[PDB]
Design a protein around this nucleic acid. Structure first.
Lengths: 150, 158, 263, 206
RNA sequence: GACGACCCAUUCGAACGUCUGCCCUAUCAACUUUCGAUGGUAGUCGCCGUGCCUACCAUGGUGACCACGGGUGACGGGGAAUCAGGGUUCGAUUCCGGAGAGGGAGCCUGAGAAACGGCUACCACAUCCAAGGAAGGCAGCAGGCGCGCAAAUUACCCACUC
RNA sequence: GAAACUGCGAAUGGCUCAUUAAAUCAGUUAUGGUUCCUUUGGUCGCUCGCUCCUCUCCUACUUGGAUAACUGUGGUAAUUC
């Protein structure tokens, strides 16, 4: 799959900009090829179309379907992904835990290889995990409501 | 009164409804219209003529929406040649402190006049009062009309 | 300049009853928004280094207020500026001191120390009565407290005693002739005297005559009057001076009589 | 851009005043709604101080009322007939305050039939007898008559009203700004208004 | 305790509106109107009142008590210099109000801006470039050129005042 | 605890006097014609409806899925690209 690339003179390619001319579009937050330096800011930069020609410097091709053969410099090389989830419910979906099992030891442990001291194993901090502290804030939340009515 | 429409729209007072309750008057009776009016306060009195009569005007304070609040002033009639309004004048004296003399200056103002008053003539004293804007050059309405000055409108035997 | 609201007030723009100098720099404190109006406020920091002189710089007040020794109206405040005004109580509990903000006959906020027992309440004028939703009433006061369910005979220009601890007023005074009043604004300021007479005009800017116990009659607008207690009997403690409003000649005579500028 | 200034325009004496301050955001226009009748399209417009303002384009329902016996039901808005501000607006079917429009007239009959226990104008009684008589006749013992007796002689319904049900349309008055509110609403014509606007309609067209 | 949210009140205001107050000029005496001038009726729009705008209808409004037009090395006021009394002359300029950021117009964000230490376009300028393109607005503090009779350091520092 | 997302401020100040003759502005009045971040004080359980459709165990002991920093590969003579 071709995901775009860079025209000569560095002009980038975005989607929905049919033909190959170099057009100056209004751009703002939530569009390709824009960085705001102030909120609500709108600039009018030049970009270049979708339709491929030989006027382009470089293209980005993403491997989608893998063939019979293995290209030597890429698909033979194997690199694992780094990080497990940081959120509660992603750990539940991943290792396929029940609602009742109390996650507390199903986190990925990320090694610190060296530091000249000792190796650490790091973990992230779970979010949306119920603890006793959570329930207090919800119990005091309702206590005030009843107190108000009285 | 029986004709008060000449517009491309119907004219009526707000805060009035026409009921369809009961049926028996015989020949005639209730004109199917109670009248709306209100007090103005500040020692000014609603005319009898307003409560008696029939007109639809929203810019008079005896019927329509518009308050009198803030200032109160007087003037005198100078001209009438416009519909539901008049022109008036304010004579006054401007002083100069280099001299010890005064001098005459006048301004002219328009102001709206109710269909309630219809006994106005050019030369009557008039009273007015501050209001919210009604029009570009109208900011006021009449509260009262009077004559109590030299060379009166009709012969002395009153 | 303006396109939105301003955030500076200079020295020389600022009022004269804070008694500012002119050889510290261009800016003055400016009270931040609150229940009192800035031509009736005494900002907090002006009480702490331009009156009592505990602090010496504004940075010192920032180190003091954070410690939470300061209260205002029995609650805790913790900022350089707060807009306390007429009839509020400051309370430092570490020193065991309590102040009250009230007017000299000169017309400026003095030091009126008081017992801690007195500092458990303040006197509040009623300004507006407003029926809320579902047949519930409200009060509105100059210190901007909304006290629900008042007694149904209390009306504006009365005054009410509020318990800072629980709100919910215990008692009140009714506006009547011959009751004792204090002035809170206008040319006459800080004078104490009984009501004597009222005058009404349909319209606005009704006035209220006053007479004191020195045999002088003066008048002021209605909305600068504040009630303090029944005739010749304040329900508050009073400072020295006591609304006499001496002429300048008599004030000269006192100073050269006691010969007082040394102790 | 398009503005609602006041520092233009001549004074009373025919004088002109030379250009003063540049246009500002609190003196501002923003083009007209020009709402029609069709499927609901609503746009939400940010306005000064916050507090969003709804602009309605192509409504087709409004809440009219029949305050004579005090029922108000939701009914479809069919077509414009009379627009007392301009003639051109009727031709392009533009909907604004104090127009005169047409409705289906359906729930008002249903309410009348159940409450006053009588039908309005009808083509034939043949339709009624198998079903729609089931409501009108009733099996109550005890409160066939006892309720309905109090409804009697409070249902004379006027001549100009009754004839209109047969056409299946009724003339009601828009008493809302659709471009500011986001809703059409109104009251149905009664009395002398309903005599008036008939005469204007027959005068102008036909 | 901390934070957030709906409404009411309050505070800081904001925006329109009332009455009175103005320098020179008639070799400027009639002015304003369907390119709305003045008013009536209805509607649109707007935070709201309002010819603000639109439709329909009326013919008004202003002036020798100086309108209308033209001029101003005219920002306004609190004030300043001189001075017996009465005045005359000045007020760019430390406080308050206003207007504007090269000239015009449009607009985004926000409670608040028609913002320029935000943006888009035209016009007048001026900069870089591999000639494909890209970037800019000192009436902020210093500093330079120019202009003229005529006016300071590309300094030190958030300790004071805020 | 760098970085990065998020909230808030950047409409205050500073500067200039070009425009501007009932305009600006000053005194006086008006919102009962309106808007108002923020502070301060009150407002904090229908409202009676879980009404879904899966045919009733229902995530309320807490629901849903992406972006930056980061890791790695780049383009342009040049940009807070």
């Amino acid at each position: 799959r071709i995901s775009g690339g860079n025209d000569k003179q560095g002009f980038p390619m975005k989607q929905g900009v049919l033909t190959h001319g170099r057009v100056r579009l209004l751009l703002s937050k939530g569009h390709s090829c824009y960085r705001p330096r102030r909120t609500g800011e709108r600039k009018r930069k030049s970009v270049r179309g979708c339709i491929v020609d030989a006027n382009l410097s470089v293209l980005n091709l993403v491997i989608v379907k893998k063939g019979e053969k293995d290209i030597p410099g890429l698909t033979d090389t194997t690199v694992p992904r780094r990080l497990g989830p940081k959120r509660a419910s992603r750990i539940r979906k991943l290792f396929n835990l029940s609602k009742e099992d109390d996650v507390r030891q199903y986190v990925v442990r990320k090694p610190l290889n060296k530091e000249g001291k000792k190796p650490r194993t790091k973990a992230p901090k779970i979010q949306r995990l119920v603890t006793p502290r959570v329930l207090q804030h919800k119990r005091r939340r309702i206590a005030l409501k009843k107190q108000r009515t009285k | 009164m029986a004709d008060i429409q000449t517009e491309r729209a119907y004219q009526k007072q707000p805060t009035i409804f026409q009921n369809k309750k009961r049926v028996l008057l015989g020949e005639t009776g209730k004109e199917k219209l109670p009248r709306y009016y209100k007090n103005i306060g500040l020692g000014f009195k609603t005319p009898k003529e307003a409560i008696e009569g029939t007109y639809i005007d929203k810019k008079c304070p005896f019927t329509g929406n518009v308050s009198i609040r803030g200032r109160i002033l007087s003037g005198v009639v100078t001209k009438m040649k416009m519909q539901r309004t008049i022109v008036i004048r304010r004579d006054y004296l401007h002083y100069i402190r280099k001299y010890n003399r005064f001098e005459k200056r006048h301004k002219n103002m328009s102001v709206h006049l109710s269909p309630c008053f219809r006994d106005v003539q050019i030369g009557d004293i008039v009273t007015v009062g501050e209001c919210r804007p009604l029009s570009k050059t109208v900011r006021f309405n009449v509260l009262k009309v009077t004559k109590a000055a030299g060379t009166k409108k009709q012969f002395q035997k009153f | 300049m303006a396109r939105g609201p301003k955030k500076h007030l200079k020295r020389v723009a600022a009022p004269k009853h804070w008694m500012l100098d002119k050889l510290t720099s261009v800016f003055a404190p400016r009270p931040s928004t609150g229940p009192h109006k800035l031509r009736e406020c005494l900002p907090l920091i002006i009480f702490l280094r331009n009156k009592l002189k505990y602090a010496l710089t504004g940075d010192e007040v920032k180190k003091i207020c954070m410690q939470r020794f300061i209260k205002i109206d029995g609650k805790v405040r913790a900022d350089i500026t707060y807009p306390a005004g007429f009839m509020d109580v400051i309370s430092i509990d570490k020193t065991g001191e309590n102040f009250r903000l009230i007017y000299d006959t000169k017309g400026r906020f003095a030091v009126h120390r008081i017992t801690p027992e007195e500092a458990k309440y303040k006197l509040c004028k009623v300004r507006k009565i407003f029926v809320g939703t579902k047949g519930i009433p409200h009060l509105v006061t100059h210190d901007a407290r909304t006290i629900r369910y008042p007694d149904p005979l209390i009306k504006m220009n009365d005054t009410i005693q509020i318990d800072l601890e629980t709100g919910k007023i215990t008692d009140f005074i009714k506006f009547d002739t011959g009751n004792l009043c204090m002035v809170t604004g206008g040319a006459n300021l800080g004078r104490i005297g009984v009501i004597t007479n009222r005058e009404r005009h349909p319209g606005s800017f009704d006035v209220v005559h006053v007479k004191d116990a020195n045999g002088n009659s003066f008048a002021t607008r209605l909305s600068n009057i504040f009630v303090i207690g029944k005739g010749n009997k304040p329900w508050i403690s009073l400072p020295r001076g006591k609304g006499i409003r001496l002429t300048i000649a008599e004030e000269r005579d006192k100073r050269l009589a006691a010969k007082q500028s040394s102790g | 851009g398009i503005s609602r200034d006041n520092w233009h325009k001549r004074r009373k004496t025919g004088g002109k005043r030379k250009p003063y301050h540049k246009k500002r955001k609190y003196e501002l226009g923003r083009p007209a709604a020009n709402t029609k009748i069709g499927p609901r399209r609503i746009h939400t417009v940010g306005v000064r101080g916050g507090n969003k303002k709804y602009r309605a384009l192509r409504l087709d329902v409004g809440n009219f009322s029949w305050g004579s016996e005090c029922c108000t039901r939701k009914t479809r808005i069919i077509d414009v007939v009379y627009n007392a501000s301009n003639n051109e607006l009727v031709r392009t079917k533009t909907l604004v305050k104090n127009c005169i429009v047409l409705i289906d007239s359906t729930p008002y009959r249903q309410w009348y039939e159940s409450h006053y226990a009588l039908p309005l104008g009808r083509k034939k009684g043949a339709k009624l007898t198998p079903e729609e008589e089931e409501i009108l006749n009733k099996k109550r013992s005890k409160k066939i008559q006892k309720k309905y007796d109090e409804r009697k002689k409070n249902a004379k319904i006027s001549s100009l009203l009754e004839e209109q049900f047969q056409q299946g349309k009724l003339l009601a008055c828009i008493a809302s700004r659709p471009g500011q509110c986001g809703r059409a609403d109104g009251y149905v014509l009664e009395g002398k208004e309903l005599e008036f606007y008939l005469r204007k309609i027959k005068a102008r067209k036909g």
